[model samples]
Target: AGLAVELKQSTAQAHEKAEHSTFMSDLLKGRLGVAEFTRLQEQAWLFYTALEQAVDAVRASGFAESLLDPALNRAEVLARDLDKLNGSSEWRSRITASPAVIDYVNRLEEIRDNVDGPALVAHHYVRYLGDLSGGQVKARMMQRHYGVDPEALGFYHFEGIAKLKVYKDEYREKLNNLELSDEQREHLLKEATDAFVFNHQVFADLGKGL
Candidate 1:
């Protein structure tokens, strides 16, 4: 089997765990209000902030050279969404990280500071691909259930990619082409699973109404 299949298979359980998070379930089921959704967006902003930094760090290191793609960047969109949800100038002050968000960002920063190539790729793959796939479902659900405007939910708007699924396939192909050693592949799979654990904890923390 290829790296793509291996990565997916290894992470499947972790993915299921993340999807079953109470916060996510509530948001999708319309049990969460705009306040809760905005909190999610704020956490997303924090996550992306550190993740983008990691991306830049890995790019500069010349490790996993293909992992840094501008089209996959989400920090800007997340910032815009936060500003639209709150206010342009006020959101920065208004939104602070929850404990879970702090943990998530800290982990991202560790990856950046350590400049671990496979670990950076693991984080990158989990977020952007999930954004293009499950992230879309969350965006549509927000619009449908909560009547959120597209402008307010800029995080889901990937204007650069016309066909998300096609682009996703191409992304997987690129992953498969990378010349990862056996040790690197194993570490990548482990880090990918741990990424979902962090994501699941974020959802769990949010469900606590923090």
Candidate 2:
């Protein structure tokens, strides 16, 4: 099987669990309020910033290079969304990471300087792809429930990519053809699954805060 297939197969359970975590389940159903939803977006801001930085550390590596497109970066959009949500850039003054969000960021930083190429690509795949797929649904739901306009919800916009499915398919193809050794492959697989659990735990921590 292709690496992309293996990644999806291995992480299937964790992926579904993340999609239906207590926090997301409530938020998706519009049971949550603007503050809660903004909190989650705030959490993503920290998460993606760390993840995007890690991509730079592996930018020279063959396996991670082609997939490290800046178009997928969420930093700017997250900032826009945060500004709209909090009504000011000053939101960063008070935004702190949840425990789980901190943990994921720490992991990204840990792996930032000296990790294997495919290992970071594992994270790249899980997060941006998740945003492209499930993230779209979440944005739409936010629109209906919170009156969130497109400007505030532009994290899922994926500008410069007109065809979402085609772009995702190409990403998988890039994954499939990456230069990965067996040892590195195992780390990628394990790290991808771990990334899902990390995200699920973030939601759980946020749920606890509620």
Candidate 3:
């Protein structure tokens, strides 16, 4: 199988594991309070800030140029969402990183500086693609359950991408276009799986408060 197909197959369980997070379940079911959702937004700001920095670091690389979509950047959108949720110009001062989020961001930084094309692709695929896919469902649930305004839900709003399914098809095609050795392919798969684990940890930590 191609790397894209292999990645999807191998990461299926990880995807399920991430979805089973208590925080996500509560939020989806309308049981979670708005304050908890705000906390999730804060954690998202931390993750995306480091993730976008990594994207920038890898911009000049052949891998990033071919696969990186500038429209997919979420760091700034996350900051805007945080401000809207916190209802203050002082949201930045109120933000604090959970240990899980700190660990996740630190790994993102490590991958940004130390890893090459494969690892970067793995992280990008795990995050951005997931955001466009299952993440959209989460967005809708937030809107429906919590009555979140569009302005506060900026992270899920893909203003530039008109057709999400078409964009995702193109994304998968680009994934297949990458030339990878067996070792590189395995590395990418591993990192993609681990990315879900990191995310699940973040959700688990947040769930503790619920």
Candidate 4:
């Protein structure tokens, strides 16, 4: 059940990050042409849609009645942010000036389409953990093991053990008290695992895209 909630929260976070990343790397950078960028933007929109879908799925499973409202609220907030980003002057001006921007946008769109939905979301939580902690492990490992700084080596770090443990505990606490049935628990587990696997796949594609 802990794992299941972990998956759900991570999936939620990943969907948001992906949406943000697509905006930054694709639309904001002027990498995609206006029409293609618009379409890609919509695909980015699909990430949120998918997130809402997953959240609704979790809610409908009946583990916790009160859980859905906050999740939905967060999703709505993210949607609003997406809309704001889309309307920015920077996004409007750059989306058409250079072919690199267009190519990057295309690549990101491809990633969004092909990325394993659940896993990407899960991994995103891991990413959030890393960002919050200053990535000491990644920072040390990169410099000692691979000669890279935390800032320069952005892609590899996801929260280390200490922070991850907190998220893990909090997630499990929510699930343990939720009064989930066996079937609901099983489905949640599936969603969580799906989040892990899909995230790895997305990372693979994104590495290539980069």
Estimate, for each residue in 1-210, the C-alpha lDDT of model 3 and write its tens digit.
677788899999998988787888888899987788998888988898898888877776656586888899998888888778888869887678998999999988997887467888898998898889876787888888888887788898788899999999999998988888989888888899988888899999999956
* Candidate number of the best TM-score: 2
Query: In candidate 4, how many Å is residue 69 off?
Result: 3.7
Q: If candidate 1 were superposed on the true structure by all CA atoms, what would the RMSD be?
A: 1.4
TM-score of 2: 0.96
lDDT of 3: 0.85
Could you estimate the TM-score for every candidate?
0.95, 0.96, 0.95, 0.38
Task: Choose the strongest candidate by lDDT.
Answer: 2
TM-score of 4: 0.38
Number of clashing pairs per prediction, in order? 0, 0, 0, 13
Whole-structure CA lDDT of model 4: 0.41
- Compared with the true structure, all predictions reach lDDT values of 0.85, 0.86, 0.85, 0.41
* lDDT by residue (tens digit), candidate 2, 1-210: 899899889899898898788888898888889999889899999988999888877885544677888788898789998998888989888989999999999989987877557668888888988877776877888889888877888897888789898988998898898877898899888899888889899999999856
**What's the residue-level lDDT of 16 in candidate 3?**
91
Model 4 misplaced stretches (Cα beyond 4 Å): 1-45, 57-63, 83-171, 181-183
Worst 10 residues of 1 by lDDT: 86-95
Error of 4 at 175 (Å): 0.7
